[PDB]
Structure 1
């Protein structure tokens, strides 16, 4: 589906303008979509500085873009309801030189277009272009392509689909709005020669003979073991013996205060802040400690300087846990895991590691894990709720999320809603909390970020958000006077806002959103007033 002409290609970075007719939320969502290009490709973006060709983003009616670099400059439109990661990703892919997936020259072998049922003025979104205009890039028809339309796209009658696959099962798949597909990234790579990315710096499932270039120090008491899953890893959940590998550190024998270091390869950063994401178990004593360290360049070039960054200790949950550690490395470094034995006479177990990822991105502000989700989803009635632990953002605001496993508002869908929690800082924070962008994300447990298609939704807190339940006062005002008391956290929690129909039960049982029968949700609550 790529425009054949080699003259129609951008030279990176793409220069851009965000027009002031975009709201704060749309500005934020475009800047968020840019980070997905930088994480999964070598496409990059810069502010406009007098270049010949550029993108300007505007709030015109609907979502649309020109195709390819048009060398005078061009518009992307992000209309009302178009401010979403996936939809902005769809439009920037047009500007990069892509047509829709149904616009391939071979598409008639794969789909039906029901021509009578398209709304007038939209028929060109269902046209096909001849092989002089477009190229296959040696790739098949990707029904999961972000550039494909959903069945009910610009239809006359809501009961009748405009587009269907010639095999009916794919009607459940066509027109996903999660993320870039694997073949969409492969096509974008094949068009622009990217193979590296700007912000994926390391990843390790431990399934290599060199263990991803990790090493172990002599200046410790013991070693971590490369463990055969023959007690199962996180990458494959024990699908076969010797297929999934992990690092294990036993704590059931020896002295207390014995330890082992696992050190990464040396890493060269391109940004000032990194996020280390990893999965772990702690089945041993409550006094065992998994400690994360950095060993960094001393400014001579010798990577020999230790810094302790975080400590983890064992509760009564012995299942796999996700961990996020903020690093702040600006010179070459190695990240380190120290496992420490404590009370071996009261440990029947140890420390486990798998599925490490390192990105040059922020770590998520709040993480909620809901266990046994496929059982919770049957045990919970329509409109019954789960509520998160309270989270604090960088500004000190308390927040949380409400999850309704069965939405009364849309059957066969999940409903996620954000709320503000009362917290220890409230007495000095500004109220109502507005111009704060909420990004809720349901993670794809893929340890490689080029494979992930995480669901995400975005909104910005506004003075327009009001409810009759609080006498038409702002939902985001101080929780002690616009919220209700909960014994689970001793909080007041606001009225909750978000999406009925966030993700379907038929989507959630796919793409590893439930990899160990558990759901992981990321929440960012951050001020975007500086985009005004």
Structure 2
């Protein structure tokens, strides 16, 4: 089924019958002291609470903005489920209300409302607007012309990619003719995006609040500089990892994939010579975690022996102040797929540490290759519960007919529920878009688990593949499993699901979004880097927010 098709704030508030300033602004110093105190109100639905907390994580992962639960502070933000989506711009000193209505529970919409509370206003309302966009007054609904009036000093250009900008179809009298068009033609496909903060959105936010760091980013490494991101090579090992440069025919670095000469560097450990169980260590610089859980993401390839082994280790403080204690975290091993692969590893370091990669030779004679590393990042966040790579996605998008589908591997959540994803690359329901939809899977735990599965938030994300989290605009969508999903869709998959021979399992009816992303949006940015599509999934209980 379709859950709910995505809608912009202008259409939501128009359907709710509001007449707010610039659509979502209530008018009745202006800069906040971090952390901003918040109250999640009783009337605010369970999905909305979880989505607001997920939006606060995005702020702590891209900015120095921070939020705390209320304790009797003077100024605060109270989040409620009144009519429409709206916010009061800037600190009001006595507290302010942010409204997240029905159909308003989306990362990009909540980020937009929080940016109003931080004191930002829409981009088409800047005095310089007329130089960058056309406003088609003859296409606006009568009485709504004031929503296009012009109304600071952060010294930045006009941002067509801004999370604050209105869509081409804002307040239209006709559904086919836009009220806004860009004076640079390419941007008619871009204006009014609902993915993430733009780069300029973050630069303005940083200039406004004196930010130069991020609460939940520890490290990243593309290996493009000569000092290799402060990583070092030990001597309690047999050999060394080489810093190769994409020059050799048929070898290309993940960061650039051969788009530039001389640039594009990866770490390599060769396995085609010497003796078995020879190894090499690559070790990070010392890191000081602020939270008790971290996620290490990286890209790798293994063209060598099936007996070769990439292993991730941590070295941590021995409790005297010396980072010398080892823990083995994770092991990776090869198969017939010689393309680049993505890996995620959970770390739980409460004290200072260094993350380590060990490459190991297996049978050197049955090896004609090596272990390859690029594009690391380390964030003070959970890892994605499931990850699905779809290969040759451009070829899939040309070959699949409307209503054909792909299905993921079966994943498992921390509670033990099985889940997966259904992808229709060519939608029948929205022509020119993907449909991504969630399904629950039968698994070995089904007998002890509660049914139907309810109060469990699903987050689906299409990864932007850019190595620095600040620069990423990953498309994201959220729902909470509910009793109201009937055709309850979330009952035990043996009773309400269809058996499939690929997973050897039952899979539920799919629920999610037609029009998750357009084909045009996937063909830009870094969503289809290497012609690989990467989808992330979480399936997490939010009943503790009740």
Cα distance in structure 2, aligned partners of 1:260 and 1:166 = 55
Separation in 2, partners of 1:211, 1:268: 19
How do 1:470-489 residues align onto structure 2 when only pairs under 5 Å count?
A: 474-489=488-503
Residues 137-148 of structure 1 correspond to what in structure 2 (within 5 A)?
137-148=154-165
Q: How far apart are the structure 2 equivalents of 1:245 and 1:45?
A: 39
Whether the aligned pair in 2 keeps the contact of 1:100 and 1:125 (CA below 8 Å) is no
Report the count of equivalent residues: 515
1:92 aligned residue (111, 114, 117): 114
Q: Which moved more, 1:22-31 or 1:275-284?
A: 22-31
Do the aligned partners of 1:295 and 1:334 also contact (CA within 8 Å) in 2?
yes
Measured after TM superposition, the shift of residue 381 of structure 1 is 0.5
Shift in Å at residue 138 of structure 1?
1.2
**Deviation sequence 1:100-153 (CA, Å, 0-9, x none):** 001111111111223354446655542212xxxxx2411000000000000111
- C-alpha displacement of 1:429: 0.4
CA-CA distance at 1:21 after TM superposition? 1.5
CA distance in 1, matches of 2:226, 2:537: 36
Q: Compute the displacement of 1:160 (Å).
A: 2.5
CA contact (8 A) 1:397 1:423 kept: yes
Cα shift at 1:48: 1.2
CA displacement, residues 252-299 of structure 1 (integer Å, 9 cap, x when unaligned): 000000000000000000000000000000000000000000001001
Quote the Cα distance in structure 2 between the aligned partners of 1:328 and 1:493: 33
Q: SS in structure 2 opposite 1:15?
A: strand
Q: Tell me the alpha carbon deviations over residues 57-104 of structure 1, each in whole angstroms, 9 at most, x when there is no partner.
A: 111221111111111111111111111000000010011010100111
Give, in angstroms, the shift of residue 169 of structure 1.
2.9
Shift of 1:165: 1.7
User: 1:313-337 CA deviation, whole Å, 9 max, x = no partner?
Assistant: 0010010000000000010000000
Alignment partner of 1:524 is 2:524:
no
1:197 to 214, 224, 231: 214
Q: Which moved more, 1:69-78 or 1:400-409?
A: 69-78
CA distance in 2, matches of 1:187, 1:317: 43
Match of 1:450, SS?
helix
Q: Could you tell which deviates more after superposition, 75-84 or 398-407?
A: 75-84
CA contact (8 A) 1:288 1:342 kept: yes
Distance between the aligned counterparts of 2:349 and 2:173, measured in 1? 55
Q: Residues 524, 52 of structure 1: CA spacing in aligned structure 2 closer, same or farther, 3 A cutoff?
A: same
Counterpart-to-counterpart distance in 1, 2:314 and 2:385? 21
Alpha carbons of structure 1 residues 27 and 80: separation in structure 2 relative to 1, 3 Å: same
Instruction: Give secondary structure in 2 for the equivalent of 1:176.
Output: coil
- Which secondary structure state, in structure 2, belongs to the residue aligned with residue 475 of structure 1? coil
Q: CA RMSD in A?
A: 1.1
Distance 1:286 1:328, change over 3 A: same
Aligned position for 1:51: 73
Helix, strand or coil at the partner of 1:310 = strand
TM-score w.r.t. length of structure 2: 0.93
Equivalent position of 1:382 in the other structure: 402
CA distance in 2, matches of 1:167, 1:237: 29
Q: Distance in 2 between matches of 1:237 and 1:126?
A: 43
| CA deviation after TM superposition for structure 1 residue 17, in Å | 1.0
Q: Is the 8 A contact 1:283 1:350 kept in 2?
A: yes
**Gaps (5+ residues) in structure 2?**
1-28
Is 1:77 equivalent to 2:91 in the alignment? no
Partner Cα distance (1:286, 1:105) in 2: 62
Task: Flag the 1:123–1:527 CA change in 2: closer, same or farther, 3 A.
Answer: farther
Give the direction of change, closer, same or farther, for the CA distance of 1:121–1:8 in structure 2 (3 Å limit).
farther
* Contact preservation (8 Å) 1:282, 1:349: yes
For structure 1, list consecutive stretches of 5 or more residues without a partner in the other structure: 1-6, 130-134, 468-473
Which SS does the other structure have where 1:39 is aligned?
helix
The answer on whether the counterparts of 1:414 and 1:501 sit within 8 Å (CA) in structure 2 is: yes
Secondary structure of the residue aligned to 1:148 is coil
Asked if the contact 1:228–1:241 (Cα under 8 Å) also holds between the matched residues in 2, the reply is: no
Moved more, 352-361 or 207-216: 207-216
Q: Hey, what does 2:350 align to over in structure 1?
A: 330
- 8 A Cα contact 1:445 1:515, kept in partner: yes
